[PDB]
Amino acid sequence: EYVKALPSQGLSSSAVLEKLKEYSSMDAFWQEGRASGTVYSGEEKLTELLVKAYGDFAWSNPLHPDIFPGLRKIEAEIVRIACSLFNGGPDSCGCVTSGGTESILMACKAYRDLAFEKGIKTPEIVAPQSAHAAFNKAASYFGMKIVRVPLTKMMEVDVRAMRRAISRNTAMLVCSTPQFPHGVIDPVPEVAKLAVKYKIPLHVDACLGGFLIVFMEKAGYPLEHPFDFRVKGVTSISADTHKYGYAPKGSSLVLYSDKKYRNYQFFVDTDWQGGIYASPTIAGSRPGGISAACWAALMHFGENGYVEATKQIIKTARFLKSELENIKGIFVFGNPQLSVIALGSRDFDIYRLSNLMTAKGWNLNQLQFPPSIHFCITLLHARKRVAIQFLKDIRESVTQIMKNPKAKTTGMGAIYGMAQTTVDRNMVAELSSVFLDSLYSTD
Amino acid sequence: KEYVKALPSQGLSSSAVLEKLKEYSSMDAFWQEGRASGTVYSGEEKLTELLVKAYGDFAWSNPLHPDIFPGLRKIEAEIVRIACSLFNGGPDSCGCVTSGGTESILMACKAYRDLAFEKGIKTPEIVAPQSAHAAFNKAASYFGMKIVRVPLTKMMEVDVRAMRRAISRNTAMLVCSTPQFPHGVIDPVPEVAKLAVKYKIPLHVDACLGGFLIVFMEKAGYPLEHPFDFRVKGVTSISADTHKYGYAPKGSSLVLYSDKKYRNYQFFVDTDWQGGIYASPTIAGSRPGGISAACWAALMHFGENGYVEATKQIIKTARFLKSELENIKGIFVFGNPQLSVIALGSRDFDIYRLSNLMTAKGWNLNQLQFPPSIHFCITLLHARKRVAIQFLKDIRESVTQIMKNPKAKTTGMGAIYGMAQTTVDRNMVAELSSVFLDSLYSTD
Ligand SMILES: C[C@@H]1CN(c2nnc(Cc3ccccc3)c3ccc(Cl)cc23)CCN1c1ccc(C#N)cn1
Ligand SMILES: C[C@@H]1CN(c2nnc(Cc3ccccc3)c3ccc(Cl)cc23)CCN1c1ccc(C#N)cn1
User: What is the rounded (10 degree) CA torsion for B382, B383, B386, B390?
Assistant: First the structure.
C-alpha cells in the first residue's frame, strides 16, 4: 500500500496521473460542503484559471528578481492592492508570504528587533487569549515572552486587563478581526488607544477576516467600528489571500503602516561567500506560480466579485446565527458578525453535538477553554446551499441530546473534554508529538 | 507597462486574466535557452505539463487538515520515506516536507537549539564552515543562536582543525555541506562526524544543492571518495532540495533526521489554544498540498533510472567544462569540484570583469565574494540545451579580451561587487541591501 522507495524505473506521465487519482479519490470529503473552513471556494472554473495562472509561472522564483521581473511586478501589485483595501495610503507597504503564520511571524520578528534596538532584552507580546496559535510559535521561535490577556463575556479582549499587562518590555499589542475560535471582532480603536498612549506597535490579525471585512460596507453590512490603517496606532495587518481572497493555498500578506517597521523584518547577510544575500521574508526560494495564481484571483473577482462573495457569505452566516440563537439547549458565543459561529451549552457537554454532527457527515472545529464547537462559512457553503441541512442536523442532534442531558460523552468528544481538565499539560503535549509522528507513518 | 495599484471595479474574465499574465511572463529572462546559472533545473515542456496536472489534482488540499486530506498525508509520508532510503537512513530515520532549503535548515537549527536549551545551554551555538549557506545566519538571527563560521583550506573545504578548536560547551550543532554553494566543494563529512561523535554534538549535513545528484553518483558511474549520508555515524540530520535536482516544483524540500528523538524538538505544539489543541511539524500552518503532489509526481516519473541518467548527463557536462576551464591562461578553478558547480578566480586580473563580459554575451553567472570569485551551476537544462560549447567559447573570448589590458578599471556591476568586499563599514552594505529589498516592492 505505501511507496517506501524510489521505483527502479520511472512511471509514465499517464501512469503517474492514474495513481494520483486514487490518492485524490480519498480527499473528496470537502466537495459536499461538510467541512468547516478548509476550502474557501473550490469552484471548478475558478480552479482551472488558477492552475493555468500557476502553470504560466511554474519555474519562476522571486529569489531571482533579475531573471523574473514579471513576477516581481505581480508581487509589488498584490501588496499595493491590499494596502489600498486596508486604506493604507502612500506610506503603507507590505510583503507577500506563504500564509497567515508567516505574516504573523514576520510582524513579531520586526517588533522584536525594534524592541532590541530600544534596549529591551526579552521583548513581550501582549495578546488576547483568543489570538492565533502562531503568536505562540513566534514567542517560541524568536525568544519573546507571550502574555495572553483574558476575554470579556462577549469573547472580546478585556481592554482593562490588556492595559494592566503592558510593561517596559512590551514589544507589541495584538487584536483580531476576527479571532478564529468565536469569530468575534476585537475592539481595534480601544486597543489602538493603548498602542498610541504607551507608544507600542499594534498588529491587527485579519488573516481570517481580511477579504470579508474590507468589503462589509460595500456589501451593505457596515461594521460598527473602524478596523484598518485609518485607526491611528495600527502599525501592521496580516490578511490571508488563500482564505476569503479565494487565492491558492500558500499565499498571504503582512502589511505595515510605514517602511520603518517593515525594515526590521528583513534579513541581510552582507558577508556571505555565496554573495551579498538579502531576503524580505522567511524563505529563500519561493513558488512564483502561487503569486501568479493569487494575482489572477484578485483580478478575476475584482471589487464586484468580492462584494458579491461577501454578501453571499454574510447572508448565510446571519441566517444561521439567528436560527442557532433559537434552539433550546445551545447558545452562540458573543456576537459573531462574520463567517464564524461558535456554539456552547450550559445544559449538556457541547462535544456530544460535534460527535453527532460527525456521525451525520460534518466536520466542525472542536474548541476549548471554554468547551465549544464552531463552523466557518466559506463561498463553497454559500454556493452549495449547505445551511439548510446544517440547521436540520444541529436541531436533530440537539433534540436527541436533550432526551438524556446527563448521559456520558463518548468517542473523540470525550478526548477533547478530558484534554482541558488534565492537570498535566505535558501529557497533552506528548500525545500531540505522537499525533505528529503518526502523520509520517508508512507502516 | 504600468502598475495595478488597486482592485479593478469589475473583475476580469478568465481569458482576460491569462492574456494580461502573458505580458508579465514575456518580460522574464531567456532561462529556456540555458544562459542562467542554477535557477531552473529542468524546465522541460512535457515534465511541466505533468507537474501542473499533479498540482491541479490537489490544488485545494491543505496538510493542516490530515483528516480532510488523507491522500495528501499518504503522499507526504512517502516523499519523506523515499528520501530517507536515498540517504540510507534505515527504519529509525524520519523527516518532514518543507517549503525549501532555508526552511529545512531553520527546522534543524531550531530542533538543535531546543535540545541544547534542555541541556542547560543558554545561548546555543552553530559551528559551521565559512562556506555554509546564508540560511545558517538567518537561523542564528531568528532563533537567538550564536554562529561561529570556521575558515576553509586552500581546497575550499572546512578546516577540521579550526572546527575542533571552535567547539565549546555551548555548541548545539556542527555543519558541513555536500557541496557548499560558493565553490561546489564537498566538505569532509566523515572527519567532521568524528568530532560530532567524540564531543556528542549533533551534525547537520547540508545537501540542499547536492542531494538529488550525490545520492545517484555511484549508480551513474561516478562514485565519490567518501561517504556523506546516514551511514556516517554522527550525522543526525540532512537537508535536501527536491525543487533542485529532484526536478520537483519550487516550494519543495526535505529535512531528514537519523532518529525521531531529534525531529520532536522541531515540532510546534500549543496545547491550550482556544481554537483547539494545535500541533504543527514545520514553520507553516496551512500549506500548498498541490506542491507535495507535484513533488511526488516528479519522483515517481523519474524513478532511479531517470535520476541516474540526469546525473550522468550533468556530471559529464561538469567534468568536461572543469578540464577545459583548468587549461585557460588567466583563470583557475577553486578547489576540486566533483559535482555541478564550478567556481573561477584570477591572480592576473579582477575576476568580476569576466562576469561583466559574460553578462554582455547574455550569461547570468553568480558573483561570489571573500575571496573574489564567480560561478556557474550546471542543470539538466544546460545538458539538454547543450550550451557547454558556447559557454566555453564565450569564457575563452572574454579572458582573451581581458588579458590585453589586465590592470584596466572594472566597470558596471562587477565594480560594485568588488567595492562591497573592500568597504570597511559593513553597515553601509547592509543599508544598501535594505534599499534593494524596498525597491522590489516599488509600484512607482
Ligand atoms: C543588488 C545586490 C544584490 N542583493 C541580492 N541579495 N540576495 C539575493 C538572493 C541571492 C543571493 C545570492 C545568490 C542567490 C540568490 C539577490 C538576488 C538577486 C539580486 Cl538581483 C540581488 C540579490 C542584495 C543587494 N545588493 C547589494 C549590492 C551592493 C551592495 C553594497 N555595497 C549592497 N547590496
Ligand atoms: C488529535 C488532536 C489534535 N491535533 C491536531 N493539532 N493541530 C491541528 C492543526 C489545527 C488545529 C486547530 C485548528 C486548525 C488546525 C490538527 C489538525 C487536524 C487534526 Cl485531525 C488534528 C490536529 C493533534 C493533537 N491532538 C490531541 C488530542 C488529544 C490530546 C490529549 N489528551 C492531545 N492531542
Answer: 50
Cα A424 to Cα B171: distance, rounded to the nearest angstrom: 32
> Which residues constitute the domain of residue A387?
13-42+303-403
Is the distance from CB of B150 to CB of B166 less than 8 angstroms? yes
Neighbours of B132 (CB within 10 A): 28
The candidate with the shortest Cα–Cα distance to B246, out of B86, B388, B30, is B86
Asked if omega into A371 is within 30° of 0 (cis), the reply is no
Distance CA B18, CA B266 (A): 40
B131 contacts B156 by C-beta, under 8 angstroms: yes
Beta bridge partners of B374: B344, B367
CATH number for the domain that contains residue A127: 3.40.640.10
CATH of the domain at A408: 6.10.140.2150
Do both A152 and A199 map to the same domain? yes
B113/B102 Cα distance (integer angstroms): 16
State the cell numbers at A158: 478585556
- What is the rounded distance in angstroms from the CA atom of residue B261 to the CA atom of residue B20? 50
Note whether A417 contacts B: Cβ–Cβ < 8 A.
Answer: no
Distance from the CA of B279 to the center of ligand 2, in angstroms?
A: 6
Number of domains in chain B: 3
Q: Last residue of some domain: B268, B303, B338?
A: B303
Cβ neighbors of A52 (< 8 A, separation 6 or more) are: B18
User: What 3-state class would DSSP assign to A368?
Assistant: coil
Kindly report the protein residue whose alpha carbon is nearest to atom 26 of ligand 1.
Answer: B433
Rounded to 5°, angle at Cα A209 from A343 and A161: 70
Name which of B156, B116, B154 is nearest B262 in CA terms: B116
Cis peptide leading into residue B371 (ω within 30°) = yes
- Grid coordinates representing A127? 495578546
> Nine-digit cell at B343?
567556481
B30 at interface of A, judged by CB pairs closer than 8 A: no
Same domain, B290 and B346: no
Shared domain for B29 and B9, answered yes or no, is no
Kindly report whether the peptide bond that precedes residue A370 is cis, defined as omega within 30 degrees of 0.
Answer: yes
Strand B203-207 to B171-177 pairing: parallel
Are A243 and A319 found together in one domain? no
**Which residues on neighbouring strands pair with residue B152, listed in sequence order?**
B158
Q: Locate the chain B residue with the closest alpha carbon to A183.
A: B275
Method: X-ray
A361 and A296 in a single domain? The answer is no
Alpha-carbon B202 to chain mean position? 21
| Residue A106 to residue A100: CA distance in whole angstroms | 10
Burial pattern A264-293, b for ≥16 Cβ within 10 A else e, equals bbbbbbbbbbbbbbbbbbbbbbbbbbbbbb
> Are B5 and B35 part of one and the same domain?
no
Using alpha carbons only, give the angle A309, A315, A321 rounded to the nearest 5 degrees. 130
Burial degree of B223 (CB within 10 A; 0-12, 13-18, 19+): exposed
Size of interface A-B (CB pairs under 8 A): 463
Does the Cβ of B275 fall within 6 Å of ligand 2? Answer: yes
Residues B52 and A57: beta-carbon distance below 8 Å: no
- Assess whether the C-beta atom of B415 lies below 6 angstroms from ligand 1: no
Residues A47, A145 share a domain: yes
Closest approach of chain B CAs to the CA of A405, in angstroms? 24
Query: Do B346 and B363 fall within a single domain?
Result: yes
| CATH assignment of the domain containing A351 | 3.90.1150.10
In angstroms, what is the resolution?
Answer: 2.4
User: What is the C-alpha to C-alpha distance for residues B164 and B186, in angstroms, rounded to an integer?
Assistant: 18
User: Is residue A107 within 8 Å of A265, Cβ to Cβ?
Assistant: yes
Report the DSSP pairing between strands B332-333 and B278-280: unpaired
CA distance B146 to chain A (A): 14
The cell for A290 is 502561487
- For A363, name the nearest residue in chain B, comparing CA atoms only: B68
